[PDB]
Design a protein around this ligand. Structure first.
Ligand SMILES: [K+]
Ligand SMILES: [K+]
Ligand SMILES: [Mg+2]
Ligand SMILES: [Mg+2]
Ligand SMILES: [Mg+2]
Ligand SMILES: [Mg+2]
Ligand SMILES: [Mg+2]
Ligand SMILES: [Mg+2]
Ligand SMILES: [Mg+2]
Ligand SMILES: [Mg+2]
Ligand SMILES: [Mg+2]
Ligand SMILES: [Mg+2]
Ligand SMILES: [Mg+2]
Ligand SMILES: [Zn+2]
Ligand SMILES: [Zn+2]
Lengths: 120, 178, 46, 48, 135
RNA sequence: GAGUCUUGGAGGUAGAGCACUGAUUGGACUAGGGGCCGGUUACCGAAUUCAGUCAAACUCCGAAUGCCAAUGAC
RNA sequence: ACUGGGGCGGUCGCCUCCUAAAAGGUAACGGAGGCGCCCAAAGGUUCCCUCAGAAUGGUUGGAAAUCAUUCGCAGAGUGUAAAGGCACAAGGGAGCUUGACUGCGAGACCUACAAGUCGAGCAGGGACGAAAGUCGGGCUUAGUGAUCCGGUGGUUCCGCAUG
RNA sequence: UGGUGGCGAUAGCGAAGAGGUCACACCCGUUCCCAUACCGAACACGGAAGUUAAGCUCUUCAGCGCCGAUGGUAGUCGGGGGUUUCCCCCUGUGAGAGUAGGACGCCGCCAA
RNA sequence: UCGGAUCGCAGUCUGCAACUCGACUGCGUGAAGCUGGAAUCGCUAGUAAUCGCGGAUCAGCAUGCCGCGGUGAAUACGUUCC
RNA sequence: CGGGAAGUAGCUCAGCUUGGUAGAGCACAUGGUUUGGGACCAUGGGGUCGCAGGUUCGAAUCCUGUCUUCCCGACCA
RNA sequence: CCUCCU
């Protein structure tokens, strides 16, 4: 037999390690990413209150992208969370990479979010 | 290769029926094949590893990693961090390509071969077989070998039990002792 | 497969003198065996 | 294991002291360290 | 002669002997037993004397449990030395026995025999004791 | 400043306990060793297990007090 | 010099534990141990990770080398004594580095003095990181010695009429 | 359902079931970014043939672990007494163990 | 491709009978041994060395013993020492 | 009583200070030599380091305890 | 160097 470890369980340990040194305030909230097999999701969160402020996923109908999985989708999602952030009056954030390697789709979201407005 | 195609088309449907699983996801497969050469004479002879690597390199087809000593041991004159072995992990095509050659070609060339044992399952459906001569593998030339030396070949599987693992390996050409 | 560090590994074709033929992957371009699963007696039965 | 002085390679000021093992580090050790005179990071080297 | 096979520290504080016994206040293995009414150190020499006295009277019939074990070391200085210049050397072994502690238990003999065997042992010990039964 | 009441807190003693370390008793149980023929025994036995003792330099626990404060009141 | 008279023996500074009576402190020629260093990574940072041991299988190969699976709050590790800590690791691995920085420092702890300890934060110029940020040696607590005198390097200082 | 938090395991282990269009997974590839002291296992990039088997989600359970009174007892501040290695009395205080009992999750925010 | 011990298997012959305990044969096996430390022996010529052959005893059993021929050396200064 | 020093093959001694290798002499054994001994020559074998515990991957070696045998000291009264 | 007793 070979009992395999859950990729997500491994990720959550990595994410806990990020979140030891990193957290959102109302003044400077936490742009968290979650990256599924099919989709990618961004929430902007403050942890003192424990409340999402803005969000954007590939499940949003505003996106007219073909592949929800790929990096191009992540760029669209990164713009959209940054746009919705600017409506709520959010400039400065901390990027919570969510346990994922700062690379690929997750980096694509982060880079798009910067260009669109958000300061990190 | 033929064994991977044989597995998906023939073996996996048979095992589904045999054991009467709910899902096809329950059907046991071969996860990996770890080939280990313990080289304790690396303590004495420095070149023992360099040779043992080169053999394992051609047998497997990947560069092996050189395993090192977890502890110092006085009985063996082993110090911690000494190279005393070499493993290589085989998955996917390189696994099936190897396992095909093992069964089809190499195990026939074993001197006085009378099957591999039915005893050698770990109790959780992983099989290990001890090779004595590296000359059995067709990549190894007879003339180039100086030091004779064998290896362990672990076949890891997603079989929970031995009888499920046994079946899978029997459904592959593996010559179990009659 | 990180490039450079491994040996060259490619199509092979093994051939029993006894007659069996099939193509594994290996280092050698033409493998020629004098025994295989179909010739050897444990497998066949004597 | 011995006391060493690292002199700034630019101005020559003996800015730092440190220790090293002579057995482990027999050659003159070099480090990039802040020179207060030059007001920047310069290469400093163990004094001969 | 009972003593521990090894000890962590060869020289220990004497400590104090307030309070009733923490445990071992009921006959638990045997049928009968002898219970301490007073606190004392019991030396391993006294345990052997008591053991023999009761065992001989039982004729090595039945079964004796020794519920105390002399684990605590005690030191003594050589004869005639002055005070100080470090603690004395290890001398013997004691069990600390508080009121209520069942010291020995007996099985496999009559109550009449048990009583007499334990009476004989009591006279070897430096404490007052009472004969006790299990419940 | 002090006393007392009230409130909060740090801390591992007394006691107690066996969760760790060490010591230790009996039963069941045997790996192994020793007498005795690869074979058997009242000879000892590691682990495991059930029950039971103990500890300044053991603690799964844990006071009374003392201590540091805050808050008014007397 | 200490000294349950002195001599003789032993000790003399520093660190850890117990004695020590649940803050802190607390003696004895009371009970136990360490230190007078080591490491150019065994330091900094970024990223990734999980240990002892056992069972079972397996060439040489054993009680025990390397391989595989399973169980596994840690029964390991943490340069080194011990204690307190440490598995979002303070333990293990890899990449890049030299913050094992210069000027300091609100405020604290400790304290007869002399010393000793902690420190956010500011500036300069950096390391690592996408960023957030972390970094003024090491999981923490030993690894050290006043003054005088002398040596060496630097120096918008003084220079016995003036240079 | 999925994401993301807070709360001492009353949240955990273990056991027995149930579920999947979407969502979450496993899953299928290695051309490309990136990757393995060897290995596309993992990480990474891409895919959707298959599957709820596992993770995940939801039921049930008190075997283990966890939480846990009341009463009593030990100890003890203060005040007395004695037969003073220790013990007793009185106004307070009051464990640990043991037990009755609780408990197989409670509370947010976002998206669908 | 030296050497042919040891052992397995299958035989042959003698003999009432080859287990203890015969010789020989076939097939398989293929040990030690790379010219031997201190020391020590024989031989002066058809000798030594080497190669076969025969015989007595004897059912069978000789690397021993007693004979037989084939090929066929080296060296002896000398008498000090053993 | 206090302080030292030893403890290694049958006997006498090195090795310990610097952790990884058990040595040496005599004796012992076998052969040779001799009529036979002795001497001589050649060729071997022999402990697991007093005992126990500890540190270490590993102890004759470093640490502790214990046992045995020695040595020194025990003064002012 | 030695060579048991009768
Ligand atoms: K006195
Ligand atoms: K590093
Ligand atoms: Mg107590
Ligand atoms: Mg004096
Ligand atoms: Mg004196
Ligand atoms: Mg003196
Ligand atoms: Mg106190
Ligand atoms: Mg205190
Ligand atoms: Mg002076
Ligand atoms: Mg002048
Ligand atoms: Mg309670
Ligand atoms: Mg003549
Ligand atoms: Mg004849
Ligand atoms: Zn064939
Ligand atoms: Zn400079």
């Amino acid at each position: 037999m070979i009992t395999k470890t859950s990729k997500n369980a491994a990720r959550l340990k990595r994410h806990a390690r990020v979140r030891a040194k990193l957290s959102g305030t109302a003044e400077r909230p936490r742009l968290n990413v979650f990256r599924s097999n099919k989709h990618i999701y961004a929430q902007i969160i403050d942890d003192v209150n424990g409340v999402t402020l803005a969000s954007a996923s590939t499940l949003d109908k505003d996106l007219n992208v073909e592949s929800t999985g790929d990096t191009s989708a992540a760029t669209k999602v990164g713009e959209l969370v940054a746009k919705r952030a600017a409506e709520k009056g959010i400039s400065d954030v901390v990027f919570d990479r969510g346990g994922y390697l700062y690379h690929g789709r997750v980096k694509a979201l982060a880079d798009a979010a910067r260009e669109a407005g958000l300061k990190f | 290769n033929r064994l991977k195609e044989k597995y998906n088309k023939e073996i996996a449907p048979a095992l589904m029926t045999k054991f009467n699983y709910d899902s096809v996801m329950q059907v046991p497969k071969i996860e990996k094949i770890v080939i280990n050469m313990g080289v304790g004479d690396a303590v004495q002879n420095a070149k023992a590893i360099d040779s043992a690597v080169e053999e394992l390199t051609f047998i497997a087809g990947q560069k092996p990693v050189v395993t090192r000593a977890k502890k110092s041991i006085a009985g063996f004159r082993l110090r911690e961090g000494m190279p005393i072995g070499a493993k290589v992990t085989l998955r996917g095509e390189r696994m099936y390509d190897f396992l095909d050659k093992l069964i089809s070609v190499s195990l026939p060339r074993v001197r006085d071969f009378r099957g591999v044992s039915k005893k050698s399952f770990d109790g959780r459906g992983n099989y290990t077989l001890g090779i004595k001569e590296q000359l059995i593998f067709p990549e190894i030339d007879y003339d180039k070998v100086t030091k004779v030396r064998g290896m362990d070949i672990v076949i890891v599987t997603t079989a929970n039990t031995d009888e499920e693992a046994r079946e899978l390996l029997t459904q592959v050409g593996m010559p179990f002792q009659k | 497969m990180k490039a450079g560090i491994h040996p060259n590994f490619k199509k092979a074709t093994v051939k029993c003198a006894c007659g069996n033929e099939f193509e594994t992957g290996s280092v050698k371009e033409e493998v020629r065996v004098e025994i295989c699963s179909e010739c050897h007696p444990f497998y066949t039965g004597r | 294991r011995v006391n060493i002085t690292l002199a700034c390679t630019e101005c020559g000021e003996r800015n730092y002291i440190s220790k090293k093992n002579k057995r482990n580090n027999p050659d003159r050790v070099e480090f990039k360290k802040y020179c207060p005179r030059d007001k920047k990071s310069t290469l400093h080297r163990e004094t001969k | 002669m009972l003593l521990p096979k090894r000890v962590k520290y060869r020289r220990e504080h004497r400590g104090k002997m307030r309070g009733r016994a923490k445990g071992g206040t009921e006959v638990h293995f045997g049928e009968f037993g002898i219970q301490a009414l007073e606190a004392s150190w019991i030396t391993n020499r006294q345990i052997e004397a008591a053991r023999i006295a009761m065992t001989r009277y039982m004729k090595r019939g039945g079964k004796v449990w020794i519920k105390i074990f002399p684990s605590k070391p005690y030191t003594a200085k050589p004869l005639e030395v002055r005070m100080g210049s470090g603690k004395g050397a290890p001398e013997g072994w004691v069990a600390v026995v508080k009121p209520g502690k069942v010291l020995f238990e007996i099985s496999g003999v009559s109550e009449e025999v048990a009583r007499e065997a334990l009476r004989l042992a009591s006279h070897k010990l430096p404490i007052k004791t009472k004969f006790v039964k299990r419940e």
